[PDB]
RNA sequence: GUAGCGGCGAGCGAAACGGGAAGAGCCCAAACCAUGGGGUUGUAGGACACUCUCAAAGGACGACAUUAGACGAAUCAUCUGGAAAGAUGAAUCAAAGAAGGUAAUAAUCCUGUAGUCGAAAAUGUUGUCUCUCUUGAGUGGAUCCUGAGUACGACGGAGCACGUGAAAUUCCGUCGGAAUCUGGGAGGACCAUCUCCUAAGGCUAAAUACUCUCUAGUGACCGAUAGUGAACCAGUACCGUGAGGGAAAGGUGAAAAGCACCCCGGAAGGGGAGUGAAAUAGAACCUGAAACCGUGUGCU
RNA sequence: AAGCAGUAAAUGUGGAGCCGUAGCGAAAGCGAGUCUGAAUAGGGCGUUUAGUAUUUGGUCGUAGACCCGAAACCAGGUGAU
RNA sequence: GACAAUGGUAGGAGAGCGUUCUAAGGGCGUUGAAGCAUGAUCGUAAGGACAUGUGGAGCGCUUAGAAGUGAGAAUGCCGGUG
RNA sequence: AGGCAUAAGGGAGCUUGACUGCGAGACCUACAAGUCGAGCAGGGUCGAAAGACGGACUUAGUGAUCCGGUGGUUCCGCAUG
C-alpha cells in the first residue's frame, strides 16, 4: 500500500524509536556504597584541635583509601515512553524504509514437516539473501523458528512482534502471503 | 543503517557539568560566586519566605471561603454543536462521543458563544438566555 | 515526591485567566477611625501582584 | 505488674499538658484494692478493682 | 498535593466515587429441650405452632516436582610459529553458532549446549477411592430470646489527615449510668422527617512486605587504593580492662621442565654451563612510570 | 495510569483519570460575559482561544543534595585491675 | 569583496577535545595489540599520528548512545622516596 | 518652612459635604503602602444667582497578618428543613 509502505522514511521520529527501544533494554543493576553504607566510620580518628594533622570526621569519608562513594551509579531504570501514534509512525517508517530500497520480498508460508536448517539456509541462499534476514511470519511457526535460530543473522518473527529496532537491523525481509496482510491490517 | 544515526537538528545537548577547570567558564566556582548562604551545599534560602522580612502571603489577609456544593457544569457552545447535522435530537451522553464532551461536571450546560445556522433539538441540563433563544429561533425545541 | 503547594498563599490569592494573581488589599481589619473615607473606599477593590512578588513567589503557586 | 482479677484493668500512659500545652508523660493507674475473693478452694486476697465491687461478687 | 488541619506559621495532608490483582464464608451466648441436641440475624432472625419431603478431625488411597546422572551432529591440509584455534585452500553439522578450557583468535579437540532419556530412596504438590460428616425445608406470627456495670455522659488524655476546636466516628483512666424490636446505632455539633445498618463474643485463604539460606541465570556492574572490612588461612596481625575498633597481603611459565656440573666465597650472592620461545620470566618471579640514588661522558 | 498478554523486551489492549476548548464572583450564581454597584454610569478581570503528550538542555522543590570539618545533644550498653 | 569587531574577574551564551562502556558497520593483530620509553612531527587549543626500542595478547576507526568522564592545591587519604 | 491682605486673618447668619457609589489620569515608589484628582450618578446645605462643599492654609498626630468581639445582609450552610 501507500499508507504503510510508501510514507516519507521519517528520522526524526526512527531515531526517538530506535533509542527509546535499546534504552528500554537497559537492567541498571549498578549499585555503589556512599558513607552511610560502607562498613566501620563512626569514630573520630583524632581531636578537633592540637594534633599538626587536617581535622577527619571519618575513615569512611570520600578521600580516604577505602571510603564511602560521593556519588555515583544507581540502582534505577531507563525506560520510557512516546505517543502511540509516533509508535506506528516509526514502525512505518521503518518498513517503508525497506520497500525505498529491495529489502522486502514477498513469499508464501512456509512449509517443513520437522525443523531442519538444511534447507531454510538453502533456501535463503537461493533468494539472493543478504546475511541478516528478518522472516516475518503470520503467526508464531515452530518449523520456521527452530530451522532458522541457528543461523549467523537470521532472526524470525511474528506479525505479532515487529520491532523498530529488529527491522532497521536487518537490510532483507521474508514475509508471507499471508502475514503482510495482517501488518497493514494492524499497522496505520 | 543503524550505523548512521542522526537525531534532530537542535535536539539534543550536552549537559553543563561545572566544576572541570577555569576554561569552560564553570571551573572553581562552579557558578555560585563567592561566599556566602548561596554558595554552600543545600544552603538556599527557601521560596518566598526567607528569614528576614515579613512575606507577601503572610501579610495580605486571607479572603472568602469555598463551598462543598459547587455543582459546575460542562460548557458547550454553539459550535460543538455544528459538527452535528440536522434533526439530530442530542443526548448528553451523544454529546461526549462525537468529540465535544468528555466529562459531565454536573451536567452539560449549553451557551450562546456563536450562531448555529442548523435546526438541532437540544437536551441538557442547564441553558443559557442566549442560547435558548438561539436554538428557538431555528426551531428543534429545547428541553431539559 | 509532589511539589506542594503554600496553603496559605492560595487562602490569599486567586488565578485570573491569565497567569496573573488576583490578591486582596491590606490595612483592612481594624483602626478605621484612622483613615480617611477616601482611603477606606479605596482599599475595597482589589489589586494584582507586581512582576517582583511573583519573582519570589511562582512554584509555591503551581498547581492554583 | 498489677492488674484486676475480674477484668484486665491496667494503667496506661498518656501526657500530662500544660496551660502552654507542654507535654510531659504520665500515667493512668487502675483503682486496684485488696480484697478477699472468696474464689474457689480459698478465701484469696487480690488487687480487684473498685469498678468491679459494684453488683456481683 | 484536592478537602481540610495548622504559633493558619514551618509544615501536615485524607477518604468515598472510578479502574484493577484477588476473591468463600462461617462458628458461638440466649429463648427451648433431653453435660449433649437447638439456633445465628435486618428482604428481622430465631424459639414455640403446620407440615414434609475458617466452617470436626485423624488415617489410608497414583501421576508430576526437588534431591545424583546418561546419550548427545559434524575437519582436514599448507605458511609463520615455541605451540594454531590465526591466515590460505577447500568440507561438514545445526531445534546444537550458550559459555569454559585447550601451548595463539575453535559451531566441527574436550567439558558442554539444543534435544531427549533416567530415580533404589527420601521428601513436596496436586488426582481419584476410602474413611468420614451431614436433613433439608416452607408458613405463622400470642408469648419468648437477639451479648449490662455494657453503650453513653462528666472530668483528664491518646488516636483518627483533623493541634479541644462548633469535633462528629473511635480507645484508655476515674466516677454516674440506659433501653430490649414502635427497640438500638450511624448519615461530621444538635434537633425532627426519611435512608441505611443491627455494637457490647469469636475463626477465616488470595491478592501484599522481606531475604539468613538453595537453585538456575542476567548485567551499556567492579576488576585488586576498585568490588564485601575480607579475591590471599579476615572479623584475622594489631590496638583496648572492657564494650569495641581493624588492617595490609593476587599475577613465574604452556608445562616445574624450579637451574645438573664447574669456578669465587664460611655462607648469602654471583659468573659460566644448562631448561625454556624467552632467565633484564629464577619463587622478591607478567609490563615496569615518576620521585630518589648512582656510573661515564659532549659543551660549560 | 495500574493491570492483562509478551524475550525482566519493545509492542498490543487497557479512556478510571489529567490538561485544553470559558470567564467572572467570597458564594448563591449568571456566562462572552460576569462582578462591584440603585444604575457597564464608570471600573476590575475576561472574550488572548492553540493546546496536549514525550524528550534534550537551564532553573527550582522534597530528599544528606557540590565535597570535607565542630563545640555539642539524645538512646542502649562498658567500665572502681 | 568592503567595512566593523576581537583586554577582561564574578557571571551569561556557543563550539569543541579526550577517557570508560554499549549498538551497528567496517578493520588491525604473534610477519607482534595495549602499555612504557625516545624523537628534530601535525592542528588555533584541548589533542592526533608516525618511526624506533622494550612488551607478549588484545586493540582501534565511523555514526550514535550512557557516564564513578578530565586533578596542582582541600594543615586532603594511602604508598614510595628524599 | 513654604504661603495668605483676591485673604488662607477677624465677625455674623444659616447649616452638617468631618455624604453614599466611584473614578479618566498622574505623582511617588523594591513590594506592601502613600498622595492628588477632573468628571458621572443618588441625596442635600448656603447663596438671588453663577457657584461652592467628599473637614481643618499645607505638610506630623500613627501600627500588616492572624485572632477574638459588636452590627447588618443577596451568600454557604456535609441525606433533607
Known amino acids: ?188 | 543503517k543503524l550505523h548512521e544515526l542522526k537525531p534532530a537538528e537542535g535536539s539534543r545537548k550536552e549537559r553543563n557539568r561545572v566544576g572541570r577547570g577555569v576554561a569552560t567558564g564553570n571551573g572553581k566556582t562552579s557558578g555560585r560566586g563567592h561566599k556566602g548562604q548561596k554558595a554552600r551545599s543545600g544552603g538556599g534560602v527557601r521560596p518566598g519566605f526567607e528569614g528576614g522580612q515579613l512575606p507577601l502571603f503572610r501579610r495580605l489577609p486571607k479572603r472568602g471561603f469555598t463551598n462543598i456544593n459547587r455543582k459546575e457544569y460542562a460548557i458547550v457552545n454553539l459550535d460543538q454543536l455544528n459538527k452535528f447535522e440536522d434533526g439530530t435530537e442530542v443526548t448528553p451522553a451523544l454529546l461526549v462521543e462525537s468529540g465535544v464532551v468528555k466529562n459531565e461536571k454536573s451536567g452539560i450546560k449549553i451557551l450562546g458563544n456563536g450562531s448555529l445556522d442548523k435546526k438541532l433539538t437540544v437536551k441538557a441540563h442547564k441553558f443559557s438566555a442566549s442560547a435558548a433563544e438561539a436554538i428557538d429561533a431555528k426551531g428543534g425545541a429545547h428541553e431539559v | 515526591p509532589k511539589m506542594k503547594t503554600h496553603r496559605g498563599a492560595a487562602k490569599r490569592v486567586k488565578r485570573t485567566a491569565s497567569g496573573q494573581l488576583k490578591r486582596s488589599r491590606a490595612f483592612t481589619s481594624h483602626l478605621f477611625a484612622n483613615k480617611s473615607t477616601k482611603q477606606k473606599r479605596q482599599l475595597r477593590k482589589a489589586r494584582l501582584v507586581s512582576k517582583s512578588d511573583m519573582k519570589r513567589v511562582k512554584q509555591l503557586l503551581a498547581y492554583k | 505488674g498489677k492488674q484486676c482479677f475480674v477484668t484486665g484493668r491496667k494503667a496506661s500512659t498518656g501526657n500530662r499538658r500544660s496551660h502552654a500545652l507542654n507535654s510531659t508523660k504520665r500515667r493512668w493507674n487502675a483503682n486496684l484494692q485488696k480484697v478477699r475473693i472468696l474464689v474457689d478452694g480459698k478465701p484469696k486476697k487480690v488487687w480487684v478493682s473498685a469498678r468491679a465491687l459494684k453488683s456481683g461478687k
Open chain 1, 1 to 188: 500500500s501507500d499508507a504503510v509502505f510508501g510514507i516519507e522514511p521519517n528520522n526524526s521520529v526512527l531515531f526517538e524509536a530506535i533509542n527509546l527501544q535499546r534504552a528500554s533494554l537497559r537492567q541498571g543493576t549498578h549499585a555503589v556504597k556512599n558513607r552511610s553504607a560502607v562498613s566501620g566510620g563512626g569514630r573520630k580518628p583524632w581531636k578537633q584541635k592540637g594534633t599538626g594533622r587536617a581535622r577527619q570526621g571519618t575513615i569512611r569519608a570520600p578521600q580516604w583509601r577505602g571510603g564511602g562513594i560521593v556519588f555515583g551509579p544507581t540502582p534505577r531504570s531507563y525506560a520510557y515512553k512516546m505517543p502511540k501514534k509516533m509508535r506506528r509512525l516509526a514502525l512505518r517508517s521503518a518498513l517503508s524504509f525497506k520497500v525505498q530500497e529491495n529489502g522486502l520480498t514477498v513469499v508464501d508460508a512456509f512449509n517443513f514437516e520437522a525443523p531442519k536448517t538444511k534447507e531454510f539456509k538453502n533456501v535463503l541462499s537461493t533468494l539472493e539473501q543478504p546475511k541478516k534476514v528478518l522472516v516475518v511470519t503470520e503467526n508464531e511457526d515452530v518449523n520456521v523458528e527452530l530451522s532458522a535460530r541457528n543461523i549467523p543473522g537470521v532472526q524470525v518473527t511474528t506479525a505479532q512482534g515487529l520491532n523498530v529496532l529488529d527491522i532497521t537491523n536487518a537490510d532483507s525481509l521474508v514475509i508471507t502471503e499471508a502475514a503482510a496482510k495482517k501488518v497493514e491490517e494492524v499497522l496505520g
